[PDB]
Paper text:
The proteasome of the malaria parasite Plasmodium falciparum (Pf20S) is an advantageous drug target because its inhibition kills P. falciparum in multiple stages of its life cycle and synergizes with artemisinins. Unfolded peptide substrates must pass through the antechamber before reaching the catalytic chamber for degradation. We recently developed a macrocyclic peptide, TDI-8304, that is highly selective for Pf20S over human proteasomes and is potent in vitro and in vivo against P. falciparum.
The atomic model shows that TDI-8304 is in the β5 pockets, and no extra density was observed in the β2 pockets nor the antechambers. However, the steric hindrance from Pro126 of c-20S β6 forces the P5 pyrrolidinone group of TDI-8304 to flip downwards and toward the cyclic ring, resulting in a loss of two hydrogen bonds from pyrrolidinone compared with TDI-8304 in the β5 of the Pf20S wild type. Based on our analysis of the TDI-8304 binding in the Pf20S β5 site with high affinity and in the Pf20S β2 and c-20S β5 sites with low affinity, we suggest that the two hydrogen bonds between pyrrolidinone of TDI-8304 and Ser154 of Pf20S β6 play a pivotal role in driving the high-affinity binding of TDI-8304 to the Pf20S β5 pocket. These potential steric conflicts may lower the inhibitor binding affinity in the β5 catalytic pockets of c-20S and i-20S, explaining the lack of inhibition of the human proteasomes.
Residue numbers in the entry:
A (entry chain B): 3 to 234
B (entry chain F): 4 to 240
C (entry chain D): 2 to 244
D (entry chain J): 2 to 205
E (entry chain C): 2 to 201, 206 to 251
F (entry chain G): 6 to 246
G (entry chain A): 2 to 245
H (entry chain E): 7 to 241
Write the structure that this text describes.
């Protein structure tokens, strides 16, 4: 077969693209994720609860590096996220090949959001069922972006996604402060996750990445263990 | 119903309704009979006139010196298939400098007409064919169907009311092999006449004949050229 | 690509998509054409005159070449597409034949484009009807009409769009050899035909004229108002004659 | 030989907190002069210029396509391009025609949009970039320009001294080349201003 | 497959294109954008909908996009569709500049984009773009210009217009407040502030861009928070005096 | 209920009903049986004769797909001929690329994957035929495979497809085919075909016999006429008593 | 809502009002149609896959009825669900691994092969014209750095590494049993891992296996090549299990 | 409706779209062709819809070639592609073989397009539906005068006299009542005009009908208003 040529996302009489709203419902049912932009870096945190202890929790990561200076996390459907991660890495490399410079975070976000938009209008496909938090560092500045299934993107100082993200956003509003440093941001992000977390959090229950001048990196379970011991 | 609009939809009974509807297309057409002896293959086609002032639609076509066909069903599909068959015979003569054997032509027709029965948006060919041919294995009568199945027949009849012709052919087939050409054509004409209603009768206007044989290239007889074959025909019961 | 059959026959032998395109045409503002002896006049109902709109940008009368112009009724964007295609074709005809197009030639081209869009996969019909007026190189004035189905005819005078039935009935009662003896009377016939339908006055009317050997000339609102005043004078004087 | 068809010469030079870019003005076809005001240096930013020598048609085409790409880049990114990024963009453009190459060898000269640091570079016709700290040259009289620059260039020149150095280099180099000259144009790019001058030059 | 096909580009029994009407319904709920043409410039004023306290500002503006040296636009409707269309607009402008080595006249850019939109309404079986655009620009043929386009591919030039939420009330206000041929940039900004106040203001909730000519060059500028705050305060005291006088 | 119209749609129970419907088409066909013995493979088919007008041998359901590989079919005959053409192309292409006779298991896998490709899409419908492939080689022995409309391929010692597959399987299970020759197996195949044939419903039928084994030197061919006459005599004698 | 539906969301892979993909869930249900169950257990220096073997007809050639496949000399897999879907997926995995070695010059890691197959599956879940495959793949192999590796991919495009896992009808009970076993301890020897896998299968089915009712495949750090056990070895394991 | 593809057979063995297109033919203006030994005469009611319309712009009889004319009925806009194909066919035949195409061959080439419509496995330029027009090809070749009828189904037949369009029933009955094989071209022209006058609604006059003839001597000839007036006067 060849793919269907007609769009599966169309306007409703009320003016809504209901498939986009349904993909957003899928996103809202995902595992909670949090991003905080500090003065000197960005922290991405996400709940990483496995169904059972049989799962090798250290085999699949939710916090992924796109480039030395760009990482991302998601809420929603994992396989869709893998697709978008692969596309984002390809786009960043293409930018680097043309301009011989690491792609700016905003440019990467715009290109990925363009792909996501394409999946709301092309024939015979559904939208991606994920929302992305993209963190980056360039021009001596940290960047935190969110990109939605519709292909719309926003710049955030702090935000929460996934299950219970409205309470998370209220909590971040109360706690967030532009002047706080990166370690305080990590503490605040873990606290935000704790609000909507079921059971005890361990270094194997959550995943954390940080972006700063040195670059983006996923934190190790030992570092997360130290931060959790401090949080208690 | 929900199973009877596309060729790619199996019904819960294991049938494909669109193919059966194309079969109906064939069953609507005017009767045609094919039969053979040890040396000859004969097609006799009853031609219809849409109006008393219109010519009767041609039912027998040339394909190659050794192959002719009689059509029943949609005539445009018949022309498509006839053009394909003609091209196949031309390709055989061009490449191998020999006439295409009749059975291989029928196999090619089968593949060609089976392809659309499995693809979305396509339809079956709405024509049945009687194929009269002569090759190294002697004379041949083949019947091809919209279902893309084909049959090798001692004799056959297709089209409206062709069951009567088939009854006659079943009754008399024992005599066909040892028939001379004239007796063979007369048997074909009697079989075809069995399809006619009481009011209608075989004439030189609504009958066409096609003959192929060892020393006889496929020849189509129409109008007064049919009178010699009709002359010896008795009166129907 | 997308290859659905959009325009298909219905049981009664009707192409519903073509009929619905003609409904869309009937929703458009009325356009009127009159074929004079030395002048062809096009008028269009400038419906819902918004004081803030830049009228130059929403003109429903346009030029296809130096000797052919067009008015339309229906979907404006489809009309823009068709007009651009026709302009390209007019230039191609100049290039290959080394002469200007006849009005009939480009009319045939547009009608063929429309018919093609009623019989090709993955496309809906154009929702516009067109009045094409012009002068052939030998000087004959020409007025043609095309509709979404791709059929076209020549007319002495015609109307399209909403209220085209009443306007056509008025033109039947008013198109005479006397009524087109002069350019003024041809223009006034077009203005009267539009006034039979337009909401009020000449404010809601855009008028263009093509004279032999000259290019498309748009009548400015002052000229239209003067013509409307003359028409009102004639109406009052003739009604006084009747009384 | 294809790049000698029209002649021409461009040169760029680095000062202390300034750059200079210069070009000859002749547009000719082989031995015949056609005009004496042909543009070979094109602005690409407030403080960023590209000079193009070689075949005149390719000079114009490359300048125009580069402006296309740069305009789109600056709209999409919302910022002025840095000199190194422009060099990479030009290299990509030229290499795209690796087997059908444009016959021009650009030089770039500018200041960093945020730091105002001097930058110069040169590219071969298929886009190999070469960043240097003193000077680059391109065109038919490259050897003459190399001699003049190797002899006259000094580090940390102020704008007036840079002007005199690049001017003397260009004038004396083109005076020994038949198909380059008919005037010289010089742009001095500083933090606060761009000074454009045309020199008194031999017109034979 | 025929069963699942939405049939986006077909007429309805009354001669309507339902997907286009629904897209216009979508635009009706988007953020308000208004354009006003004056003798010495043209302005766009857009209501910001991204007003959450934790949002960061990193860009030139939220809803106003520069299209080329002489042209900018505002978009109401689906944001990602708008990004697609703004990229296409920039590409069209640059293609024109490459071919002719002059900036594209504003109406030509608008027509080129509306052709794409109209194409999406006539064939291909795709949903149309759910975007309406206001364009402001300057060219040498017609000077300062303001255009509007909608998902159907229709477009028109305006002296003042509004798209998005409460566009009808804003249009009524402009009809009763715009002085044809007698508008300056200053009075245009005052009128924009008044109209946005009615169809809704505070500085952080609106972005305003002006387009003017200075020394034969086009200047496109987004007013900073200081200028917008001053305009809002000027409108507030003007309204206070008007109320007191009565 | 709407779930059974396309092969690209799972029912809520995880079934693909279009494939099951194609299998029903197979089930409404006259039976064919293949039997693997020590020396080779024997195929028998109960070709129903739908009218005396047809020449003997019309609508054959045994095909040569390669010198060493025979194929017996049940279901939609046109689909079966299409699959036979596919199998022939696969064997010829394999010989062209690798320079030797395609192993039967590999050919069966390739054709089964071709069949499977038609079970995934709304663009096409599943094949309406099941078929057996038989081969014998010195290096590989005797091999018998069966493929069904879903694309499932399995090797067998005895296989029956068609409307009387279960009764034919019950009869086949009574033979110790692993220690028999093709010469006795042809008689047993004829007997089974005659047993399972429904004399009332099915009217008349021709017995089609083919085999491939040591006695044919690895070439698949129709059973010689005298052998078939002996086998049919034995089958009729077994029926009458 | 709960189990709500709009438009065609039950027939093609478009989101339901809840954000679900019903066709993917139906493919998961199709996995159980085969009626079989497989288990995989990761030891200290070995990985083992056990699976039910069913041959209801004595006319079937039992050698040809298997669910264990070599993907590469060092990578083996057990497939669960619709057989033809499984065979197509095995063909695709073999192609991916051979292409990987051809393009990069070293053998594909198990995790990367599982990711590639899962990406193909994900594509099936976003394009409406084809259905997802109704099968689940469990891969085992020895990675030179990580040691033994057990990975699973499913029709949703979701994959993961596991200490132990199961697929098929008795997946949930198998996972409960294995969860208890790994909780008590995880550092198993080769014999211990094989016996744990066999006991999981036997307990969930409640059968005591004859050698011919199950299939076993193993990779070990000593012999990383994927090996399918013979009825002799299986019977040795079964007797060593019964005696204890 | 879209519940079916354009290539769907009905339970009676007919393509739905072709039957609907034939229904469309039954809405066209009436045309009548008569074949005699001295030539072929085609006639067609113009069906003027408004006195403001120009009757000369209604082209229902067109020249395919000097020796072939075509009358049409139904959706006339659809006929343009078929007419152009016929014209290009005759000119290709002349270019290749240096001879004139027979009427039957031209009719066959046109009829080969009737069923060339479909949606899937169709490249752009493919027709989405059948042509809704019926054609009467009249001509003169080596076999004398020839009249052929083609309908949307691709079936074409030679006819002595045929009526197509809305009133084709009564017209055909009258043609059967009046036609004999020995009639002269003048007789055929008079009879066709009488039948048209009978089945038409507007009064038959020289402006609201079209009449052409093909003869072995003269080429395809369209009657002028004065010739039409002369023929009509004797009715």
């Amino acid at each position: 077969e060849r793919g269907y040529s007609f769009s599966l996302t169309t306007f409703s009489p009320s003016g809504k693209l209901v498939q986009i709203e349904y993909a957003l419902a899928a996103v809202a049912g995902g595992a909670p994720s949090v991003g905080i932009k500090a003065a000197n870096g960005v922290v991405l945190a996400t709940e990483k609860k496995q169904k059972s202890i049989l799962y090798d929790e250290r085999s699949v990561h939710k916090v992924e590096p796109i480039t030395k200076h760009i990482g991302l996390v998601y809420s929603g459907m994992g396989p869709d996220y893998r697709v978008l991660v692969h596309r984002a890495r390809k786009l960043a490399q293409q930018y680097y090949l043309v301009y011989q410079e690491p792609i700016p975070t905003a440019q990467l976000v715009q290109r990925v959001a363009s792909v996501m938009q394409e999946y709301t209008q092309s024939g015979g496909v559904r939208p991606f069922g994920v929302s992305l938090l993209i963190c980056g560092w360039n021009e001596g500045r940290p960047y935190l972006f969110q990109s939605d299934p519709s292909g719309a993107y926003f710049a955030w100082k702090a935000t929460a996604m996934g299950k219970n993200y409205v309470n998370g956003k209220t909590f971040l509003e109360k706690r967030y402060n532009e002047d706080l440093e990166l370690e305080d941001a990590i503490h605040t992000a873990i606290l935000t996750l704790k609000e909507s977390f079921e059971g005890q959090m361990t270094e194997d229950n959550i995943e954390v990445g940080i972006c700063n001048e040195a670059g983006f990196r996923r934190l190790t379970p030992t570092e997360v263990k130290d931060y959790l011991a401090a949080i208690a | 119903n929900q199973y009877d609009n596309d060729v790619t939809v199996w019904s819960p009974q294991g049938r494909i309704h669109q193919i059966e509807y194309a079969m109906e297309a064939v069953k609507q057409g005017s009767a045609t009979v094919g039969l053979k002896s040890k040396t000859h293959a004969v097609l006799v086609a009853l031609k219809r006139a849409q109006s008393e002032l219109a010519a009767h639609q041609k039912k027998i076509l040339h394909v190659d010196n050794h192959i002719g066909i009689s059509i029943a069903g949609l005539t445009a599909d018949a022309r498509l298939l006839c053009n394909f068959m003609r091209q196949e015979c031309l390709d055989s003569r061009f490449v191998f400098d020999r006439p295409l054997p009749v059975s291989r032509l029928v196999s090619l027709i089968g593949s060609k007409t089976q392809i659309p029965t499995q693809r979305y948006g396509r339809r079956p060919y709405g024509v049945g064919l009687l194929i009269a041919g002569y090759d190294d294995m002697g004379p041949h009568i083949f019947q091809t169907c919209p279902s893309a199945n084909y049959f090798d027949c001692r004799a056959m009849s297709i089209g409206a009311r062709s069951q009567s012709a088939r009854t006659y052919l079943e009754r008399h087939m024992s005599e066909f092999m040892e028939c001379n050409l004239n007796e063979l054509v007369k048997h074909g004409l009697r079989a075809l006449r069995e399809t006619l209603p009481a009011e209608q009768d075989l004439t030189t206007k609504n009958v066409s004949i096609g003959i192929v044989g060892k020393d006889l290239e496929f020849t189509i007889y129409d109008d007064d050229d049919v009178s010699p074959f009709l002359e010896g025909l008795e009166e129907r019961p | 690509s997308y290859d659905r059959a959009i325009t298909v026959f219905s049981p009664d032998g009707h192409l519903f998509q073509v009929e619905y395109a003609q409904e869309a045409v009937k929703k458009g503002s009325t356009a009127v054409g009159v074929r004079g002896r030395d002048i062809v006049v096009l008028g269009v109902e400038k419906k819902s005159v918004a004081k803030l709109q830049d009228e130059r940008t929403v003109r429903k009368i346009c030029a296809l070449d130096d000797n052919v112009c067009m008015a339309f009724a229906g979907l404006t964007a489809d009309a823009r597409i068709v007009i651009n295609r026709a302009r390209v074709e007019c230039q191609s005809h100049r290039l290959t034949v080394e002469d200007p197009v006849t009005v009939e030639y480009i009319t045939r081209y547009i009608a063929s484009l429309k018919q093609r869009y009623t019989q090709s996969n993955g496309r809906r019909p154009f929702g516009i009807s067109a009045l094409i007026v012009g002068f052939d190189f030998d000087g004959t004035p020409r007025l043609y009409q095309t509709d979404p189905s791709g059929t076209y005819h020549a007319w002495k005078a015609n109307a399209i769009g909403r209220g085209a039935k009443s306007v056509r009935e008025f033109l039947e009662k008013n198109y005479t050899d006397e009524a087109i003896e002069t350019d003024d009377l041809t223009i006034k016939l077009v203005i009267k035909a539009l006034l039979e339908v337009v909401q009020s006055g000449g404010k809601n009317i855009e008028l263009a004229v093509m004279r032999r050997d000259q290019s498309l000339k748009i009548l400015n609102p002052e000229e239209i108002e003067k013509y409307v005043a003359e028409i009102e004078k004639e109406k009052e004087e003739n009604e006084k004659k009747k009384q | 030989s294809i790049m000698s068809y029209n002649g021409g010469a461009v040169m760029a030079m680095k000062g202390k907190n300034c750059v200079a870019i210069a070009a000859d003005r002749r547009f000719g076809i082989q031995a015949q002069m056609v005009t004496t005001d042909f543009q070979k240096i094109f602005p690409m930013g407030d403080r960023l210029y590209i000079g193009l020598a070689g075949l005149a048609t390719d000079v114009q085409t490359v300048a125009q396509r580069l402006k296309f790409r740069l305009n789109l880049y600056e709209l999409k990114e919302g910022r002025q391009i840095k000199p190194y990024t422009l060099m990479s963009m030009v290299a990509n453009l030229l290499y795209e025609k690796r087997f059908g190459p444009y016959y021009t060898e650009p030089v770039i000269a500018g200041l960093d949009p945020k730091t105002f640091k001097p930058f110069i570079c040169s590219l071969d016709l298929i886009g190999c970039p070469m960043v240097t700290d003193d000077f680059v040259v391109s065109g038919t009289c490259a050897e003459q320009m190399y001699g003049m620059c190797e002899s006259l260039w000094e580090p940390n020149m102020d704008p007036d001294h840079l002007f005199e150095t690049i001017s003397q280099a260009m004038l004396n180099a083109v005076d020994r080349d038949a198909v380059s000259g008919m005037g010289v144009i010089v742009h001095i790019i500083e933090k606060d201003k761009i000074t454009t001058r045309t020199l008194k030059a031999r017109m034979d | 497959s025929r069963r699942y096909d939405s049939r986006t580009t077909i007429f309805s029994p009354e001669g309507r294109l339902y997907q286009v009407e629904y897209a216009m319904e979508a635009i009706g709920h988007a953020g308000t954008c208004l354009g006003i043409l004056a003798n010495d410039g043209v302005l766009l004023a857009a209501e910001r909908r991204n007003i959450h306290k934790l949002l960061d500002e990193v860009f030139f503006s939220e809803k106003i996009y520069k299209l080329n040296e002489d042209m900018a636009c505002s978009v109401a409707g689906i944001t990602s569709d708008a990004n697609v269309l703004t990229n296409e607009l920039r590409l069209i402008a640059q293609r024109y500049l490459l071919q002719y080595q002059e900036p594209i006249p504003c109406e030509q850019l608008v027509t080129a984009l509306c052709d794409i939109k109209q194409a999406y309404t006539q064939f291909g079986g795709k949903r149309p773009f759910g975007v309406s655009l206001l364009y402001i620009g300057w060219d040498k043929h017609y000077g300062f210009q303001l255009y509007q386009s909608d998902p159907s591919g229709n477009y028109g030039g305006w002296k003042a217009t509004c798209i998005g939420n409460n566009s009808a009330a804003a249009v009524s206000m402009l009809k009763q407040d715009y002085k044809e041929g007698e508008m300056t940039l200053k009075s245009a900004l005052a009128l924009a502030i008044k109209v946005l106040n009615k169809t809704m203001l505070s500085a952080e909730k609106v972005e305003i861009a002006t387009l003017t000519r200075e020394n034969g060059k086009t200047v496109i500028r987004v007013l900073k928070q200081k200028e917008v705050e001053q305009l809002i305060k000027k409108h507030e005291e003007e309204e206070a005096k008007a109320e007191r006088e009565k | 209920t709407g779930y059974d119209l396309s092969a690209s749609t799972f029912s809520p129970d995880g079934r693909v009903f279009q494939v099951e419907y194609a299998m029903k088409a197979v089930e409404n066909s006259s039976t064919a049986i293949g039997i693997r013995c020590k020396d080779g493979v024997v195929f028998g088919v109960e070709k129903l004769v739908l009218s005396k007008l047809y020449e003997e041998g019309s609508n054959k359901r045994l095909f040569n797909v390669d010198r060493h590989v025979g194929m017996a079919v049940a279901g939609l005959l046109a689909d079966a001929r299409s699959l036979a053409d596919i199998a022939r192309e696969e064997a010829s292409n394999f010989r062209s690329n690798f320079g030797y006779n395609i192993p039967l298991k590999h050919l069966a896998d390739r054709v089964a994957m071709y069949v499977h490709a038609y079970t995934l899409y709304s663009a096409v419908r599943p094949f309406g035929c099941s078929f057996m492939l038989g081969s014998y080689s010195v290096n590989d022995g005797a091999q018998l495979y069966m493929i069904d409309p879903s694309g499932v391929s399995y090797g067998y010692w005895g296989c029956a497809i068609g409307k009387a597959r279960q009764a034919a399987k019950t009869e086949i299970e009574k033979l110790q085919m692993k220690e028999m020759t093709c010469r006795d197996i042809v008689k047993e195949v004829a007997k089974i075909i005659y047993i399972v044939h429904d004399e009332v419903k099915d009217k008349a039928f021709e017995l089609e016999l083919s085999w491939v084994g040591e006695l044919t030197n690895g070439r698949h061919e129709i059973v010689p006429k005298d052998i078939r006459e002996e086998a049919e005599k034995y089958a009729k004698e077994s029926l009458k008593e | 809502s709960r189990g709500s539906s709009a438009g065609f969301d039950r027939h093609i892979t478009i989101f339901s009002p809840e954000g679900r993909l019903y066709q993917v869930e139906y493919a998961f249900k199709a996995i159980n149609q085969g009626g079989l169950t497989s288990v995989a257990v990761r030891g200290k220096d070995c990985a083992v896959i056990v699976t039910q073997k069913k041959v209801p007809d004595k006319l079937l050639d039992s050698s040809t009825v298997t669910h264990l496949f070599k993907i590469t000399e060092n990578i083996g897999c057990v497939m669960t669900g619709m057989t033809a879907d499984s065979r197509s997926q095995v063909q695709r995995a073999r192609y991916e691994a051979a292409n990987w070695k051809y393009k990069y010059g070293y053998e594909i890691p198990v995790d990367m092969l599982c990711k590639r197959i899962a990406d193909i599956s994900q594509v099936y879940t976003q394009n409406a014209e084809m259905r997802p495959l109704g099968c689940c793949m469990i891969l085992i192999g020895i990675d030179e750095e990580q040691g033994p590796q057990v990975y699973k991919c499913d029709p949703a495009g979701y994959y993961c590494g596991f200490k132990a896992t199961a697929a098929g009808v008795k997946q949930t009970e198998s996972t409960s049993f294995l969860e208890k076993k790994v909780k008590k301890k995880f550092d198993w020897t080769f014999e211990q891992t094989v016996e744990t896998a066999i006991t999981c299968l036997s307990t969930v089915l409640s059968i005591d296996f004859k050698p011919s009712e199950i299939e076993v495949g193993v990779v070990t750090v000593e012999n990383p090549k994927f090996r399918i056990l013979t009825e002799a070895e299986i019977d040795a394991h079964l007797v060593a299990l019964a005696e204890r | 409706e879209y519940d079916r593809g354009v290539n769907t057979f009905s339970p009676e063995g007919r393509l739905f779209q072709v039957e609907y297109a034939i229904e469309a033919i039954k809405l066209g203006s009436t045309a009548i062709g008569i074949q005699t030994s001295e030539g072929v005469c085609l006639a067609v009611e113009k069906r003027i819809t408004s006195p403001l319309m120009e009757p000369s712009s209604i082209e229902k009889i067109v020249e395919i070639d000097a020796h072939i004319g075509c009358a049409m009925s139904g959706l006339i806009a659809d006929a343009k592609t078929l007419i152009d194909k016929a014209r290009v066919e005759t000119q290709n035949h002349w270019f290749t073989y240096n001879e004139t195409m027979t009427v039957e061959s031209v009719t066959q080439a046109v009829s080969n397009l009737a069923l060339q419509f479909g949606e899937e496995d169709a490249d752009p330029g493919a027709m989405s539906r059948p042509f809704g027009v019926a054609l009467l090809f009249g001509g003169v070749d080596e076999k004398g005068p020839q009249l052929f009828h083609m309908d949307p189904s691709g079936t074409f037949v030679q006819c002595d006299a045929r009526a197509i369009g809305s009133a084709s029933e009564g017209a055909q009955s009258s043609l059967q009542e009046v036609y004999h094989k020995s009639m002269t071209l003048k007789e055929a022209i008079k009879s066709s005009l009488i039948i048209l006058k009978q089945v038409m609604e507007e009064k038959l006059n020289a402006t609201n009908i079209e009449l052409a003839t093909v003869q072995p001597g003269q080429n395809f000839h369209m009657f002028t208003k004065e010739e039409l007036e002369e023929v009509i006067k004797d009715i």
